[PDB]
With several copies, the nearest count.
Chain A
Amino acid sequence: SVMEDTLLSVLFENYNPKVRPSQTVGDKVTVRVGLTLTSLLILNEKNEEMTTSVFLNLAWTDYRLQWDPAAYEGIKDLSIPSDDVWQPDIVLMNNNDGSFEITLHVNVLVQHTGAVSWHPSAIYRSSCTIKVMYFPFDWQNCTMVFKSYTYDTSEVILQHALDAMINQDAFTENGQWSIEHKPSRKNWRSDDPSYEDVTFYLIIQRKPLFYIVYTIVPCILISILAILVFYLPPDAGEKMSLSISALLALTVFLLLLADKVPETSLSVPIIISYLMFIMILVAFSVILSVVVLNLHHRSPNTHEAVEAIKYIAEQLESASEFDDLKKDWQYVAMVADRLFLYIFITMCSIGTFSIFLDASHNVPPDNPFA
């Protein structure tokens, strides 16, 4: 009773819905912003698009809602729909690639002397620079800048919790990636009067090892038929034609591979590294098989009286066997041996190279997890 109807009344009589919990132009209302992440569902590492979900915990004080006996001293804590406070119509300078879901228009926790607690989980369409640099083992970092899209920091100050909180705090276990750390730094670019956005850093690490495995098999298994086509010559010289069949076959195979590679990066591309040199490794088996094909080509051919008849017989046979013996002199196997071992150098050299680069790529550019 104690002026309850009265209080109750006066409050709703004088209280202003559309007003800011501050008095004039000054230090403003110090709103607390801090989100406990739920998990993340889709990383479009290719366009640098980020759809995650977290809690929008906001909290500041409404010294305009401090109650009295019944709602203050009666029930120190009571729930009341928002819709009555300035809400950070927050957009993300890079990210905020789309609207809020479970972000605004939801109830809030209002304390006795005016404290306000609003904890809503939400899904948000963002876009961070995971750029086409989300695959190097050295990976990269990003700028996630949150802030309102009609307000300018003049009638409120934004403030954070931790900066180490981490993003693996609610990292998706469903992620083909992994994370090292999440930096959180408060910002106010001076290119705009409006103090604004906060930059949040993603020192992301995404190592999904699954198909590069059977990709290796091509390179090496194709090599099987490759070393084979380079081995088949002094193995079965008649490989002559069958050889060409091999490369038709070998080339179509690698071209189909050419088919799956562009359409697969089509959703998760970054530096060429792997492709850069396998591209070379490609060109390598490609041309090596084709010049060996020219190795194959280079051969212009390969690619008394009684006794007289006898004598005429003696000369017939012998005469042309030298001729076909000439073909021997012409297609001997010197080259095959020499370049099948130049094949030895080439393929085992260029092989242990990307082997190496790849080797160097996973270990060397790994520690910049920062």
Chain B
Amino acid sequence: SEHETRLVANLLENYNKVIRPVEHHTHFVDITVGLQLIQLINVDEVNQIVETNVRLRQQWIDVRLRWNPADYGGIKKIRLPSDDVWLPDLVLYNNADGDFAIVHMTKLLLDYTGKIMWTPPAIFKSYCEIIVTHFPFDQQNCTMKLGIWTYDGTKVSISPESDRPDLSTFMESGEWVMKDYRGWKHWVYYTCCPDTPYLDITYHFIMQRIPLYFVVNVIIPCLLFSFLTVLVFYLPTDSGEKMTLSISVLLSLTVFLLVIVELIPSTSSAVPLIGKYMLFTMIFVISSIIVTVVVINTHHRSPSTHSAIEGVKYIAEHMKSDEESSNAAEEWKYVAMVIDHILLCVFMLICIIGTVSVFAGRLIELSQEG
């Protein structure tokens, strides 16, 4: 009725969708961004890729959408679908690995005045720093910049909307844990050109990694091996009868250490941990190495151990006596006096190396835990 058909048709005719609500040569189209990650689905620190939930709150005004009693008078605020709207080519700077998912053909709301919001339920593919400094106990801050993609601060400008945590909807299924995250605004003008360039939202993800299951399995076969090597020390000094017997273990155990290496480097390759983490294992594991080789070479270190009728009796007794000598010689080879030395020599070494391994372990755990 009330100019019913005349209302609706007029609107269609003189209105070009593609036109950008440019208002004189100035303020650019003022458009603000506001991301609220509802939640995260999955991440790969190794490949620094994340699939996340984002509701993008996009705001801007088109004074061409203002109305009178025949549009606003009809029903204050209403639902108009996107299409007709000029969609900022939003883009995560050093990220952007994937298209915005569910950004397309959604709707928006127009007020009696004009103000419009476009907030389609997104979830997409991301790309943020993790560097080999993300899995640390001391984390790294995922630097993520967002802003207008192909338009300049003269044609348009993307601005921020508010502060909010990243652990606000951080995934509890993540193999990592959050410290804090902040985001502040910025305008990037380049010494290149004397012009005034796009605006941007810079995310900073500060989170520290490593789920604790890993922790237990690995350090315990170490104190495990510690005891066998501990036995590697005590077994010899309290019984050199099974030196070779331990030859076996030395084989079974470094190979155990070798195969643990396949498993944890793929972990290494599975998750990017700051290499300086690797040196822990480096000297630790390798002392199992230098100590053995010496301990067991030393274990090994030892030469071979690892009237007339009366005279008859004395030529015979003399035979038993110098072989008597001989027996004592090889025993004069494998002494039990210094195998005790190596026992405390290295156990203090191990309690040193060990407590030294615990050192930096404990130390930056004095930093991380904080």
Contact = CB atoms under 8 A, between A and B. Distances in A.
A323 B18 CA distance: 106
Contacts of A306: 309-310, 313
Interface stretch (B28-36, B246-254, B289-297, B345-353): B246-254
The 7 closest A-B pairs by CB, nearest first: A309-B313, A303-B239, A248-B252, A303-B241, A305-B310, A241-B245, A244-B245
A298 B310 contact: no
A149 B320 CA distance: 100
B240 to A, nearest CB: 8
A293 B241 contact: no
B259 interface: yes
Nearest to B38: A93
Which one of A91, A286, A303 has the highest number of Cβ atoms from chain B below 10 Å of its Cβ? Answer: A303
Contacts of B75: 25
Interface string B47-70: 000000000000000000000000
Contacts of B241: 240, 301-303
Contacts of B249: 244, 248
Interface string A229-253: 0000000000011001100100110
A97 B41 CA distance: 9
A97 B53 CA distance: 11
B107 interface: yes
Interface string B36-50: 000001100000000
A213 B336 CA distance: 49
A8 interface: no
Interface size class of A (residues with CB under 8 A): 20 to 34
A45 B228 CA distance: 39
Contacts of B245: 240-241, 244-245, 303
A252 B242 contact: no
Nearest to B307: A305
Interface of B: 41-42, 75, 102, 105-107, 120-121, 173, 217, 221, 224, 227-228, 231, 234-235, 238-239, 241-242, 244-246, 248-249, 251-252, 255-256, 259, 263, 307, 309-310, 312-313, 316-317, 320
A175 to B, nearest CB: 24
* Secondary structure dominating the interface of A: helix
Given A248-B249, A255-B256, A297-B235, A149 B309 contact: no
A245 B245 CA distance: 8
B231 A294 contact: yes
A199 B235 CA distance: 64
B183 to A, nearest CB: 23
Contacts of B320: 316
A293 B310 CA distance: 52
B259 A300 contact: no
Interface string A215-240: 00000000000000000000000001
Contacts of B256: 251-252, 255
Nearest to A294: B231
